[PDB]
């Protein structure tokens, strides 16, 4: 029922629903079967960094995941989001575990949206940046198992007392304010987001990954979207 | 019941409750009887501009109202907002009419909040800027008579069909997201806001003006705060 | 001798050197014969607005020119600027007249450059914004006939006393500070610029237009690059 | 000959020229004998963080030095910089050693200047942020012993091969572009800067500290301003 555009960091290859048989980043447009992907050397235990970028002039959504000192995977997909998203949306992060599991820690998150026309480069803008999460974060909507305060961190999926990931968990966090991503007079709309994540898995076969998603404002976790559906899509079509 | 800190643009001198007998800007801390004011040459029909500024190192809240080509009135008040506001607040604009009346148009509005510690100048930030208001502004909470879309403008108080101000009107608009204005580890918290307003009055004796206010997150118009109480305070104590 | 990447607003079609036989925007990479163009309805006398955007993940340089209420022309070109520009450059505007002429007024200009790695979305940044030009603008390098102060405006090419454009004129303006546009560790470098221009021509056959260009830091006007060479390139190859 | 406004981090108490007999931060206006100071618990070996802030409405210059987990010293001084600085200035950092010595490492630096009038909150702005210094930093003017590239760090004063501070050293670094700090129409001018520093001293009696200074654009090290004069002032009057 929801419209979802997402960039997925996928740590487990469900080949039966279109996954490359490796860890990959991907671009999803309304479906979990990514429109485009790229091989990703998931570095268990290391803190990574994901940048998403988009602007309506170029009409190309791009993403990069990089680890401190070395690797970057990267992926882009030309798409015009005017005819996909609604002009008001909410922005968030999502992650799930299933049979196998991993921590899905978000250590920081920032987003910037601009609607520019001409009028001497005049704008509408939203910007937020958490470089630390409070135990009482009144400006995040937490959904599912998502919790905060865990060392100043956003724990998207459930973790037991000692610091071990639990299975079939699904959490999401959305910024509280609606976002006006597109508008018909805007000669250039654009956005870009970054978050630093730490994925850790003991059972060295992690699952399921994390996603940054833009949705219709009233989105909530579809029934039975733990594991391979990333808490985003209600089926795998 | 609400905690309010506000900067008031007061167009009508209610001397019986502590007003200088002229148009003034003022700084209110929990009371409508301003802690500090300054004479203001209200320029009926002209578009003005107000800048509010604060930072917890200097502990001095300041405001300026200026009209295109010429006048600025200005006012500051040393106050430590740690021991006044709650650490989560909502930010908004407010305006009312009473026996006499004026249009209370807001043409644009922007706000920026930062919580900085050290860690190589690292931050938490919120920022929004409307340079035009939509007819369906999903990120403003409108209270009272406040409406949008009126030529891309925020009409804080009621105006009849032809463009004439109505009496005893009270509207408010608050940004949708809670704001974390203060936090105990922040070595410097700070904020600053600007809005451009157009006040017009036919009955050349305008009232009551406009205010930018920070409140507890769940604030709403106190009963019978039209006219001299600016839709902010429930009594005049 | 110079390396130039530029986006040209071309008001006069020199078909003999590869121009579409109409007003066009274009993307130049080291040559005046654009790599890509788009038809442009030059609106003599109206103030227009140009946005340039680039980021090294998508590797696509895009531009839009829009006039207040209505038209936008737009153009993009996938190019990897790592292997074109030097990692330190200067940024500027350029414009020329020749046999025919036009005013080449810049009313405002802003630019933003970021070099991001990971390290929790940490950056290097430069940003400037002139919304008005001083008569003594110590942070612009003016070259050729370029002058400031003309009503708070940057007059790229020569204009006589009464406000009439002169022929075979060439001016350029560059921001004073070198800019570090690219660096080998940056997992995402990006920039974007906007300027509002007012072109006016009495002899209703205007020439030669305006360009935003990135060059090696020590660039200066090539000999005899008035008219169709926009003060950018020394020949038309 | 130079006009200097500076905030000094002073690690060595020269009581004979007006120092409190302890490590202090201070505000200097044209003289090394600070207008105002505050006790500072210099934490040898730890990375500290300094925030300077100013805006022309409040007319109060403030500074904070804080160390990770714990201490902050703080100091403010009401001063109107319109009648002190020239409207074009350069901004920089400075540090010196003398008989005793310390490393004077700058690990990052950022600055933001705005000239706002009304016109719906419209601006002129400069902003730069180095979160790492290059070996070939084309946008810094280095003066005296100041060098870069030293682990991605700005080494304001001379350090020998193994990492030991040398005596009677004086370095300065200024951002390349002139800065327009004040202008007569600005209804609010404002600036703010941050840098992270690491001071280390083996001879546990460190000297002389570091300063952030605004000067006339053509400033250079006064003769014999090593040690207690911080490379800023030519005498101690
Ligand atoms: Ca999967
Ligand atoms: Ca009143
Ligand atoms: Ca041409
Ligand atoms: Ca001293
Ligand atoms: Mn996948
Ligand atoms: Mn009052
Ligand atoms: Mn051309
Ligand atoms: Mn001192």
UniProtKB/Swiss-Prot annotation, chains A, B, C, D:
GO terms for molecular function: D-mannose binding; metal ion binding; toxin activity. Belongs to the leguminous lectin family. A carbohydrate binds at residues 12, 99-100, 228. InterPro entries: ConA-like_dom_sf, Lectin_LegA_CS, Lectin_legB_Mn/Ca_BS, Legume_lectin_dom, Leguminous_Lectin. Homotetramer. Mn(2+) binds at residues 8, 10, 19, 24, 34. Coiled coil: none annotated. It comes from Canavalia brasiliensis (Brazilian jack bean). This is Concanavalin-Br. Glucose/D-mannose specific lectin. Has anti-inflammatory activity in rats. Induces histamine release in mast cells from hamster and rat. Induces lymphocyte proliferation and IFNG production. Shows toxicity against the aquatic snail B.glabrata at concentrations higher than 20 ug/ml. SUPFAM superfamilies: Concanavalin A-like lectins/glucanases. Keywords: Calcium, Lectin, Manganese, Mannose-binding, Metal-binding, Toxin. Ca(2+) binds at residues 10, 12, 14, 19, 208. Binds one manganese (or another transition metal) ion and one calcium ion. The metal ions are essential for the saccharide-binding and cell-agglutinating activities. The keyword 4Fe-4S does not apply. Pfam families: Lectin_legB. The keyword Cell membrane does not apply. CDD domains: lectin_legume_LecRK_Arcelin_ConA (cd06899). PANTHER family: CONCANAVALIN A-LIKE LECTIN FAMILY PROTEIN, LEGUME LECTIN DOMAIN-CONTAINING PROTEIN.
């Amino acid at each position: 029922a929801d419209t979802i555009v997402a960039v997925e960091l996928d740590t487990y290859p469900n080949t039966d629903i279109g996954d490359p048989s490796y860890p990959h980043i991907g671009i999803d447009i309304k479906s979990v079967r990514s429109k485009k992907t790229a091989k990703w050397n998931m570095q268990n235990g290391k803190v990574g960094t994901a940048h998403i970028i988009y602007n309506s002039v170029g009409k190309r959504l791009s993403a990069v995941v990089s680890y401190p000192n070395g690797d970057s995977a990267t992926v882009s997909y030309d798409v015009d989001l005017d005819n996909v998203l609604p002009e008001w949306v909410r922005v968030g992060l999502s992650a799930s575990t299933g049979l196998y599991k991993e921590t899905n820690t978000i250590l920081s998150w920032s987003f910037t949206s601009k609607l520019k026309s001409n009028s001497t480069h005049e704008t509408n803008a939203l910007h937020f940046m958490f470089n630390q999460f409070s135990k009482d974060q009144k400006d995040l909507i937490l959904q599912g198992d998502a919790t905060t305060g865990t060392e100043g961190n956003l724990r998207l999926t459930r973790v037991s007392s000692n610091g071990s990931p639990q299975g079939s968990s699904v959490g999401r966090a959305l910024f509280y304010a609606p976002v006006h991503i597109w508008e018909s007079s805007a000669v250039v709309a654009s956005f870009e987001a970054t978050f630093t994540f730490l994925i850790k898995s003991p059972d060295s076969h992690p699952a399921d990954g994390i996603a940054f998603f833009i949705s219709n404002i009233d989105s909530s976790i579809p029934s039975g979207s733990t594991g391979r559906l990333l808490g985003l899509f209600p089926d795998a079509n």
